[PDB]
Amino acid sequence: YSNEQEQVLGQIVLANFANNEGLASQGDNVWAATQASGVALLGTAGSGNFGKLTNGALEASNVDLSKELVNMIVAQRNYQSNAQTIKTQDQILNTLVNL
Amino acid sequence: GKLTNGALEASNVDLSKELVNMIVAQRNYQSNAQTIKTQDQILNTLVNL
Amino acid sequence: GKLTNGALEASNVDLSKELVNMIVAQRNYQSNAQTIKTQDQILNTLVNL
Amino acid sequence: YSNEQEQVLGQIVLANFANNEGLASQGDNVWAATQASGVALLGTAGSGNF
Amino acid sequence: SFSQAVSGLNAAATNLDVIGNNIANSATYGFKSGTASFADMFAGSKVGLGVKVAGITQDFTDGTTTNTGRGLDVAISQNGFFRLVDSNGSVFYSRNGQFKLDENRNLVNMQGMQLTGYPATGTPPTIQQGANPAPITIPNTLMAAKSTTTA
Amino acid sequence: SFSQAVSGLNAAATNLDVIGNNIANSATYGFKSGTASFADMFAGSKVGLGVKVAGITQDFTDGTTTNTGRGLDVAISQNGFFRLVDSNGSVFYSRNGQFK
Amino acid sequence: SMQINLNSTDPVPSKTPFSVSDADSYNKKGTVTVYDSQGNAHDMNVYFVKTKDNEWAVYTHDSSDPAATAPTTASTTLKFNENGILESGGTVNITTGTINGATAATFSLSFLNSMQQNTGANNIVATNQNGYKPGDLVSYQINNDGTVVGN
Amino acid sequence: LDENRNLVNMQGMQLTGYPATGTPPTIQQGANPAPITIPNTLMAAKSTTTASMQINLNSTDPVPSKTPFSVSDADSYNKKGTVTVYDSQGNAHDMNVYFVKTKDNEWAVYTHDSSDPAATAPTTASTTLKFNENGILESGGTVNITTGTINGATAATFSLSFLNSMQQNTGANNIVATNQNGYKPGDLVSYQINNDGTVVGN
Amino acid sequence: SFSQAVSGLNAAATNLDVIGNNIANSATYGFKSGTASFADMFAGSKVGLG
């Protein structure tokens, strides 16, 4: 304030879950707690089992582009292999029908 | 805030940050283009069965 | 709206967004042609009975 | 409006059915209510089962 | 007999879609990558009926912390989730720390979801670490004065 | 399928347009930088339908003050906006202090 | 139910008697949201005040009732043994107030599994209650074991 | 890690293994495998039952000048050390151990609890460490020590050891090792699986 | 990947700006010089991001 005095308006609460993999993503970089993830355990930053908060900073995504590209290549090759299997079954069925 | 006479507030655009972000963005765009290329090859493979 | 003299309103066609749609529509067209070919083979195997 | 004030004209209604699969398609990306689907339940977006 | 080949093609398509989605959300502060988990579906016979996707598992590893600077921006380290509420009272969780004050002076993210926390009450206000979490507000009302009682 | 990659390309293009607007406006008194904020589009399935541009956020950091020697030039330090009126009486707000 | 952990090193508050407005008059405050017969939310505040080592007076108040009487008598007394395990006073029957004519709810509040040892500070391990508010059907599902569940 | 704190695979089948029983918990391999679970159950405190203080002593130290002993006066003793023990509630008791050289190779050690404000200062020898011809500890290496009663917690009595302590021409008296088996309550911070299959919660 | 080099470049730019500001105030009565303080940004992985 302007009177050389400050006030506290609130304290941001943090949530921790037993099962992180159980949280169902609802989009808009937002998660919703469900039965598999359990009930949310609430607390404050830096106390208990919570990490502290960094001010003036944002956490970026953990997506590495190189690994994604290589996995895309491998998955494309696997998809084409499965398509080859489908073609094989097609030729087998065509051979039997042409009998 | 107070007003300073005889001067202007310049832009807050730092050029080095913009250049680095441009490099990152272009690469991301190229990665997404590669994704589209992969899915295009997938659809071609399935069609040509 | 306002009128700006000495200026022209360019088109609103973005080439990137278009080329991608061209690829997608090409794939849709090829899929429909594949369906046509399938029905053609259906009629063929029925006729040759 | 131009008088620095906004005015509401209406609210879009949303309809949910007990049986979506029972809806009889009429074409033109349009569905029609039938006995199999049941009577449509009306409501507002973002509330209840909407 | 396409029982296996069709399932394999579907699994490969799902994995490729997951990879493409990961590629697309590369610049989404608060995004965690995903990986498809596959399982076979042997059923009675030994012929290996096919494959199925057992689920999609997130990768909840902390991303790089970038000092954008905007004061409201808060990055979270280690474990924890930011808690938000929509207009209908539902509770949601997010690692994205890009916040702004709306017209009613309520801390909201880009989508308008109200950030929650322990509110303060009393004179002087004290953080009610017990009080059920409430949306955080930053009123601009003028602050009253306290008569001198201890010096 | 195609939708995820299309959304990713659109988001990358929007980011690049924001960067281009910022870099072309590096020399503009009172201009504030912009940054695109992205959000994913999960809907029911866990497949991650894609990404979308949640918005473009301005950065209202006080820029460097540059003198010019003109008596009608004034800059707003810290917070504050110049209030302006057009021909129709509509109100507007700007940080640029070049007046004539 | 309210499982809490209390610190054995906390000094006895100076400001006798206990006052809800006086923060210095109590050691710890917690909140539990219960629901009455009609479905109104009662934010029951539970206050822990240390009296003598191995003794904690517990007071209760209704923060949703504007006509609730100010608590002047200790609601119960938690006594922890020399090993820090709760020995007596862990259960008490508590009745809330009346809001807009709704029937007050009488429920048993249990401090089972609460322990007093040398922790960092007073922290509430867990809170739970078996009441709820009216709910509208949102979704339905069939689980792995065949049970049909409506959320 | 599911909602019930068990280790399960993607399909939900629970991983099995040898459970841990006893205090301190150890893997008992004589039992049948059981599903592995990781509870948040706070860990209780352990009052100390065994403490150890290995120290090296200087031979050239002169005897204390200001007889008698006072815990307040620094010149009244040769050395002072601190060991933190824990009672039934996990409260910290700071045992100060005082070394006064009495005769050649003979060192009286006093024990005083500084965490209890109402405890009286010791006036009589708690133990007399005897060192042989060359450091080698001779006798008096183990002493029963009783804590004070603080905040209603049970006082923890324990055996405090000076084994392998030496007294030679070392430059000065400095503590080499202090150990104790007690700990204060702690909450679950992390969990890990070792390369030998053990699941360990930190 | 890119974030590490981005952080390094931003730190170097901040140091350069601080040095330039100090030089610009070479003749400024009562001015005290400034120096940037740097710290690594390890987060979980042993790579040490930035």
UniProtKB/Swiss-Prot annotation, chain G:
It is found in: Bacterial flagellum basal body. The keyword Acyltransferase does not apply. The keyword Nucleus does not apply. GO terms for biological process: bacterial-type flagellum-dependent swarming motility. Its main location: other. One of its GO terms (cellular component) is bacterial-type flagellum. Keywords: Bacterial flagellum. Belongs to the flagella basal body rod proteins family. This is Flagellar hook protein FlgE. It comes from Salmonella typhimurium (strain LT2 / SGSC1412 / ATCC 700720). The gene is flgE.
From Swiss-Prot, chain H:
GO terms for biological process: bacterial-type flagellum-dependent swarming motility. It comes from the Bacteria. Keywords: Bacterial flagellum. It is found in: Bacterial flagellum basal body. GO terms for cellular component: bacterial-type flagellum; bacterial-type flagellum basal body; bacterial-type flagellum hook; cytosol. The keyword GTP-binding does not apply. Signal peptide: none annotated. The keyword Isomerase does not apply. Belongs to the flagella basal body rod proteins family. This is Flagellar hook protein FlgE. It comes from Salmonella typhimurium (strain LT2 / SGSC1412 / ATCC 700720). The chain holds residues 102 to 303 of 403 of the full protein.
